Every structure is written in C-alpha cells, then in structure tokens.
Amino acid sequence: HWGYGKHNGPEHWHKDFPIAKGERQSPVDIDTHTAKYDPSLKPLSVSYDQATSLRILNNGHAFNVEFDDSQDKAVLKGGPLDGTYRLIQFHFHWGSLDGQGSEHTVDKKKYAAELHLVHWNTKYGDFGKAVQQPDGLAVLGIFLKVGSAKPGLQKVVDVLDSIKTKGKSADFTNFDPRGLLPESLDYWTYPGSLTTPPLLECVTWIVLKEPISVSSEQVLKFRKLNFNGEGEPEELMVDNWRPAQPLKNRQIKASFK
C-alpha cells in the first residue's frame, strides 16, 4: 500500500520500512561545491553492446524495461566499483510539471525526471541476494531536462499506451539502452539505498553530471500512465519520486575536477 499520495507517500514509508530513517538513504542533494574530487575513481565502463531487452512492465510505481540478466550481456564495471554489475532493468521517476521529478538534486535543483539503470554484482548470483549486501547494486542515475527530443527514448514512449495500468506488460525486445546515455560519463558517487521500499542500503550510486534532453511531448506521455489497475479509478502516474534524504555521515565524491 506504499505509494506517492498524501496518505501513502514517502513520509509514511518508515512505518512499514523503518530503514527509511537509516544511515545511508537515497536520494540526496548533490552540493557541487562540497563534492570531493577523488583521483582514485576510475572511468566508468558501460558495456551494453550485447544487451537483451525483454519486456516492459507497469508495476504500479513506474515502468520497468527488463533485461536478460542470466549472462554478462550488459554490464557496468570500473568507476568506484570492484566487481562486474549486470543490468537487470531501467526505469524513470518524473513529475507532474517540468520543474520537478528527479530524485537526486544538484545544488537543490530538481530535474524533470531521472533515469535509473539498475545493476547487480554478479558475485551474489541473483538480484534478490545482491540487495542484502552493502555492495550489491550499482545504479546509474541520469537526469532528464526538457528541450530537444531524445531519439533513443522514443521507442519507450511509443509503447506506454499498451501498459497504461498497473500489472500490464508488453514485449520490448531489441531496445538499445546506449541511446539513453549523455556524451560524457563524468559522475558523482556515494553509498546509498533503493529509493523505493524496501529501501535497502545496498546501492553504490553513480550519478552522471551531464543530463539528457527529452522533449516536452516525450515526458507528457510518461504522465499519461496510471498508478491504478485496469477498471479502477484513474490516478495518473506522476510525482513518483522520493525527495532528498539526510546526507548524514557521507561526502559525495566526484570523478572530475
């Protein structure tokens, strides 16, 4: 019953998921002036050439584009990481208006949306085991601003009318997630959590500095999705973001000067 309404939204989550008030929760605000350049950080290595997308699912919170994670087909390495992390799914968080929607913020600025490419450390064997570990996941976060269309997003936008309501899924083969990346792979990183219940503290966050641009029309189509199931009262899927959480005993690291 958690969600994003007044009665079940982020300020309520702690009642069922007490780690919501934990020591390494996400998202956070990234203060660009107080992030520390870390010369030990390596370039990201994003290897998505053999990615195999399978399906797109409206899960009642967002939509997930799911991948075949039974082999190292689409992996993230390098950066702050000391293992190989398989891509399992990506999804977005977005607003009702262009002035909100991102989870992370930058000098307190919200973006219109945020893309999360979710990867799990292969040494743990499955995603469910990985989320139990302090280094189980690596989530690659990418901000979306509204301006020119993102060509590589359009295939996603166009299928959304077929997964309008909670529990719908559709085929989604042969999608190339490389078309969602910005040019630069400069990033910030810090230890954090899942941003939805169960809010587990298992994520090495890697947030790219350079946003991608999407069109107003693309993000308008995100906002036509529904949180509800078919045959239930229509609740638009908008404002499915958790606000910034206390930084606590963390300093964010920058890959760039």
Ligand SMILES: NS(=O)(=O)c1ccc(NCc2ccc(B(O)O)cc2)cc1
């Ligand atoms: N956030 S949580 O602690 O898991 C939680 C919060 C609320 C509830 N139940 C009450 C509730 C559930 C859903 C909605 B709604 O607008 O769709 C409103 C009220 C159940 C669990």
Ligand SMILES: NS(=O)(=O)c1ccc(NCc2ccc(B(O)O)cc2)cc1
């Ligand atoms: N928004 S986010 O921090 O990227 C993010 C939030 C939640 C999730 N996964 C949610 C979740 C957690 C555990 C299991 B399981 O199989 O035990 C399945 C799904 C994945 C990413």
Ligand SMILES: [Zn+2]
């Ligand atoms: Zn997310």
